[PDB]
Amino acid sequence: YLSKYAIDMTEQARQGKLDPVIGREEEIRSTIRVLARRIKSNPCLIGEPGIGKTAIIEGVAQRIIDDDVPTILQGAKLFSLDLAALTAGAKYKGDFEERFKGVLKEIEESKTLIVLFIDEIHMLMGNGKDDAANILKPALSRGQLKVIGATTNNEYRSIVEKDGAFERRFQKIEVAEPSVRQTVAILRGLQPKYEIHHGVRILDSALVTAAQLAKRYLPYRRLPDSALDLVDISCAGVAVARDSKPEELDSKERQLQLIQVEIKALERDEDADSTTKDRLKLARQKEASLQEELEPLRQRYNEEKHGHEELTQAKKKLDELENKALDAERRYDTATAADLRYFAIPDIKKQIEKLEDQVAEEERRAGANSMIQNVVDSDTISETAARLTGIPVKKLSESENEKLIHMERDLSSEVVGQMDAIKAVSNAVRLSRSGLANPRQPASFLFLGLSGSGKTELAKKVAGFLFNDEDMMIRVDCSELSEKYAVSKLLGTTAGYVGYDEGGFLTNQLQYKPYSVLLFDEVEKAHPDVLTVMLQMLDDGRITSGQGKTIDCSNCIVIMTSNLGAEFINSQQGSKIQESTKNLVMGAVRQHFRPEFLNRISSIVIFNKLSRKAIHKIVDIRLKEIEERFEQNDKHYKLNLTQEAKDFLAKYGYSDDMGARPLNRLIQNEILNKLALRILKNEIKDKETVNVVLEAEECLEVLPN
Amino acid sequence: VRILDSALVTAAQLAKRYLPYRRLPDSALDLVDISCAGVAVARDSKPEELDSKERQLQLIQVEIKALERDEDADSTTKDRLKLARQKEASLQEELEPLRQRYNEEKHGHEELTQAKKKLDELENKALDAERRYDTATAADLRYFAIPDIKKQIEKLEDQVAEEERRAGANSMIQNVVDSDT
Ligand SMILES: Nc1ncnc2c1ncn2[C@@H]1O[C@H](COP(=O)(O)OP(=O)(O)O)[C@@H](O)[C@H]1O
Ligand SMILES: Nc1ncnc2c1ncn2[C@@H]1O[C@H](COP(=O)(O)OP(=O)(O)O)[C@@H](O)[C@H]1O
């Protein structure tokens, strides 16, 4: 009774009822190719989920369906296999065997050409193996019973290593996440299914932005479904608003009720017969306007909706007319194709065109309909992504280039001085951007200078700037990168030893944050063995863990920080780094890192000493930022440090060893302490006044309370 | 898929040369099996050349029929389907010979397939007979049985025929080319 679980996908394809397959034509051919092999003919689709593996299998079916497959496979019937067949359909330890043997018998003995498939090949075997199909199939594997499997490459590798024997039967086919442009084409191919499902028009630019967004917004989900997820969700958003619309409709009915109350109050009161408030007639104009407007808002919006419903159904009609016309062509019924395919042409073109004309236009805009009822690229999808990811405007405004154009400017606002560091970074970043750099390796930098210099701050600010999120940064505790390196580190414990869920700190965090910066805290303290590990992974971003699991990085900016040249910067020969001083640094770097390492760094950057000139600005800046990030609209500060607190901060706070590190702490301590005190006075309600009253910091600033 | 002999020569060379860890007796076959499949796929609808032209034919056939029955089917806008039909037919006239050459040769190919298998079966059984000194059984499997299969093979190979350009003068090679494919 395999027929109770197995799904004859070939038949479903004969009936359509499947999404079209876009962009995998070669994978399909490859699959077919493998199936066509006389010996090695059991392919697997190996790679990530959400990228059309099913579609490929179905694509094969579709070619079988349309006689676009060599005879050997042309007559084949493709069946989805499932856990349910052996588990749900068994519920006893050995009934898994019986259910599978059922399949093997029924299939081996009938209909000549049958292909089975498992979209979860790892599922077979399972933990403990238990001959969960996995041996029985080899037992009869010479007896045709062609089958295609599939899994995440990382697991595939593990499966090969775990089982071995199926390797002699199965042909992995590498599949991969499609490009953005391919994705858009896919989205376009699937667009009508959403159009129809939701009854929402989709802008072509919207599809484009969905893909663009998936690449920075849903960075760990696979692009094609992810973009589709954005589409589906976005469409749902629109549809929900569309079929409800209470914000305008209910608010305005409530506004009518309120103006009616005002009018009656004005009509019968002491001032009703006076000059005072003789503007009552205008309230009546509002009431009358609403009395006439409100039902038309409900009806007009529904008229817009109806235009979109009819439009949707016209588009649906086309999909259906073609699904049947094309099936007629498939079945060689050229008479129906001549009639039906034909009718579809002016039917849908004239119907849809005029239904689009119902949406119409106004003198000031295309689309007279005010409820939009479509997916608007950024207004809908990017907005949706923002609803899924945060910081709407900066995310909405992303354009690559505007950031790159003003990047150093903006960064110099965040980071004071060391503009050359900023420019250096910006430049390398610009090369990473626009694809000028070789894509195998992201820009990467070695930040040299003292604690409190901003090396890390900047790197975070850059992440801030580039990803609109400073906390994208992944930190690496380099001094802990000992000769024992593996377990809590990117490599992770080698598979086969206890730990599979390894290196989450870096492998997974990076998986979740590809669009980030990886930063090495005092990289010179890393053990040399580890340095070679990161080196191979420094460039050649295609990182693979000790579990054999590929991480795959490219984009991630990599920044190393170092105090190695601290002695040279400690010369304090002005702020700006001087000749010789910098060379001593280079020397030390060359001693510590093999040039091979260094050669992979896009740039080695030496930060200047911030000195007093920078902190004159930094303390002002940080103080303001502290307020701004600290609170929103219940605390409103003057933050006027006056020259005296600025000087105190510079004099006692700023350190030539610890840089701004103590400035931050100091500012926070003293301001927060004064703030808390006056808050406790509770004679304190809103706005602000600040001031200064005259060992280290004996003045203690002292603001009014 | 018939394959030019030099292919095999090159396959083994290529396998050793480029399929690092795979062993020759099997990896060479992997190139064969894969490339055979390559061709088997490439040929799609019977031999190569034909497939592509059939795809043109079918796209044309549909266009013509859609054009045939339309609001403006009688306008030269759509009536151009008659010229499209000349193309459909012209393709059909090339496609048929490609199909027929492939198919009749295929038939011969299958007859060769079976004949050779049958030849081996007769000899296997005849050997069983001779090792037992059973000349009667060996004779039953050698007199007529064997002359029949051998002559079928010779006739079939001649009908298939071969050219310097290809191991199959008609179409069942799908133009597979040693090193190129
Ligand atoms: N071009 C495409 N055509 C149809 N589906 C696609 C395409 N590209 C990606 N997909 C998606 O891949 C999914 C099915 O394949 P896949 O995700 O790899 O299988 P699985 O369901 O195991 O994840 C579908 O949800 C489908 O939307
Ligand atoms: N605007 C700024 N310009 C330069 N440095 C800054 C600025 N603001 C803060 N910093 C300091 O840089 C430090 C973080 O970077 P870094 O000096 O490398 O720190 P750490 O040595 O702890 O890793 C913080 O202590 C921070 O106060």
Curated annotation (Swiss-Prot), chain A:
Effect noted on mutating residue 169 to M: Reduces ATPase activity by 80%. Impairs oligomerization
Reported effect, residue 338 to V: Increases basal level of ATPase activity and abolishes stimulation of ATP hydrolysis upon substrate binding. Inhibits growth at 37 degrees Celsius
Gene Ontology BP terms: cellular heat acclimation; cellular response to heat; chaperone cofactor-dependent protein refolding; post-translational protein targeting to endoplasmic reticulum membrane; protein folding in endoplasmic reticulum; protein refolding; protein unfolding; stress granule disassembly
Effect of residue 600 to M: Can oligomerize in the absence of nucleotides
Known outcome of mutating residue 19 to K/W/Y: Impairs prion propagation
UniProt-reported outcome of changing residue 454 to V: Impairs oligomerization at low protein concentrations
Positions contributing to ATP 1 binding: 47-54
Consequence recorded when altering residue 297 to R: Impairs prion propagation, but does not affect thermotolerance
Activity modulation: Inhibited by micromolar concentrations of guanidinium chloride. Inhibits the ATPase activity, but does not dissociate the hexameric protein.
Effect the entry attributes to changing residue 330 to M: Increases ATPase activity 3-fold
Region annotation (NBD1) ranges: 2-246
Record carries keyword Plastid: no
Sequence positions bearing Phosphothreonine: 334
Miscellaneous: Present with 32800 molecules/cell in log phase SD medium.
Protein's UniProt name: Heat shock protein 104
